[PDB]
Design a protein around this nucleic acid. Structure first.
Ligand SMILES: [Zn+2]
Length: 127
DNA sequence: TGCAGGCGCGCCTGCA
DNA sequence: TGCAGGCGCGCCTGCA
C-alpha cells in the first residue's frame, strides 16, 4: 500500500526482517482503520511530519480489553504506534503520560482511543 | 466474481 | 484488579 510507505518513512529505529514486517502490518492495520474516517490519515501524517507543531487526535475504537491484535500479537494500540514513530524502547503504557491537548488519551475509558504519538510524553515508570 | 480460508475481537483461564 | 495467553465465532478479501 502506498499510504503505508509514506507513514513507514517516519518509523524510528533499526528492527530485524521479522519486526520490520510486523511494524508494516501494524501500520497497515491502522491505515485500514483510519481510512473509513474523513481527514484521519491526513491528521496522522501531519502530526508525524511536524513534531513540534500542534495536531488533532487520531483515534480508533476502544476494545473492552484495550488490546489490538496484529498478526497474532497483542498489545495496547497507543504503545504500538508510539514505538513505531517515536520510542522503539518503550517498555509499556506506564512510560506514557497524555498531554492536556489530547481528548481521547488511553485510560480515559471513552468509545475511542487516541493513537497520535505526539499526544503522549515519555515518563519514567513508577516503582 | 464469490466464498473459503485467514485472523482479529471478545470471550475465557491462570497466576499474581 | 491487571495482564498474559488460549480459543473459536464471525467478518473480510484474496485468489481460485
Ligand atoms: Zn489525542
Amino acid at each position: 500500500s502506498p499510504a503505508v510507505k509514506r507513514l513507514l518513512g517516519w518509523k524510528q529505529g533499526e528492527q530485524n526482517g521479522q519486526e520490520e514486517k510486523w511494524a508494516e502490518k501494524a501500520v497497515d492495520a491502522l491505515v485500514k482503520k483510519l481510512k473509513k474516517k474523513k481527514g484521519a490519515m491526513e491528521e496522522l501524517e501531519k502530526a508525524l511530519s511536524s513534531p513540534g507543531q500542534p495536531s488533532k487526535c487520531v483515534t480508533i475504537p476502544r476494545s473492552l480489553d484495550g488490546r489490538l491484535q496484529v498478526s497474532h500479537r497483542k498489545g495496547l494500540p497507543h504503545v504500538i504506534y508510539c514505538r513505531v514513530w517515536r520510542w522503539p524502547d518503550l517498555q509499556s503504557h506506564h512510560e506514557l503520560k497524555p498531554l492536556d491537548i489530547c481528548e481521547f488519551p488511553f485510560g480515559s475509558k471513552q468509545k475511542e482511543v487516541c493513537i497520535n504519538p505526539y499526544h503522549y510524553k515519555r515518563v519514567e515508570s513508577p516503582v
